[PDB]
Design a protein around this ligand. Sequence first.
Ligand SMILES: CC(C)(C)NC(=O)[C@@H]1C[C@@H]2CCCC[C@@H]2CN1C[C@@H](O)[C@H](Cc1ccccc1)NC(=O)[C@H](CC(N)=O)NC(=O)c1ccc2ccccc2n1
Ligand SMILES: [Cl-]
Ligand SMILES: [Cl-]
Ligand code: NA
Lengths: 99, 99
Amino acid sequence: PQITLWKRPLVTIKIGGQLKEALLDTGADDTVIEEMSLPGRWKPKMIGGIGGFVKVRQYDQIIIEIAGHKAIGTVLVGPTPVNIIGRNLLTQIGATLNF
Amino acid sequence: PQITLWKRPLVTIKIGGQLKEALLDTGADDTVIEEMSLPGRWKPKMIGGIGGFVKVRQYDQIIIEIAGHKAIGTVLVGPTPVNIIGRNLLTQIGATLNF
Ligand SMILES: CC(C)(C)NC(=O)[C@@H]1C[C@@H]2CCCC[C@@H]2CN1C[C@@H](O)[C@H](Cc1ccccc1)NC(=O)[C@H](CC(N)=O)NC(=O)c1ccc2ccccc2n1
Ligand SMILES: [Cl-]
Ligand SMILES: [Cl-]
Ligand code: NA
């Protein structure tokens, strides 16, 4: 698809068998999802957003479908108002910005 | 241009007579620039993201050049660690996300 930006670039993702809404974010280095259960061990990570730094749980090698495109990569879990798909996964689905 | 997402999508902007580097940010509703003076009226605003909220000054009808493309819109000025070009100006330069 070609997605314009007049509204938020929200898509459906599938993770852990469940469907969620998420934002395609070229400004995010990483992918951050609201509290949910994921398999395996996690590692600590501190991420910085516009209002300051927050602690999250880093899960590696997680299967995730993004607007029907399959990816397997790192997902950060923590308190966020919006699920964010960052560049680590945008590059797996072959997304570019064009003007 | 086509911009890949292997790295942060940073471009040069001209704003208020100054050259700056800024992030093309599809996950930002607003354009937020580090502290600088701009002409005309402003009003206070709180904006949020990861980590909470920050107080900014809202300047309306500000011209900006983004990678060579002129646009006008609202610009927020405040203590952001990175200058961000959000959707309000990305639409004006015809930016799309493609995959
Ligand atoms: C997600 C994470 C990996 C932490 N990356 C970032 O957060 C990087 C950090 C960079 C350095 C600090 C300055 C911002 C840039 C770009 N951001 C990405 C950037 O795209 C970020 C992602 C995001 C979206 C929605 C909610 C939270 C977070 N957007 C934002 O921070 C913008 C700022 C704005 N007012 O325009 N927020 C929003 O547009 C926005 C949208 C919906 C909301 C709902 C409730 C509360 C707040 C909400 N904020
Ligand atoms: Cl605007
Ligand atoms: Cl358009
Ligand atoms: Na003005």
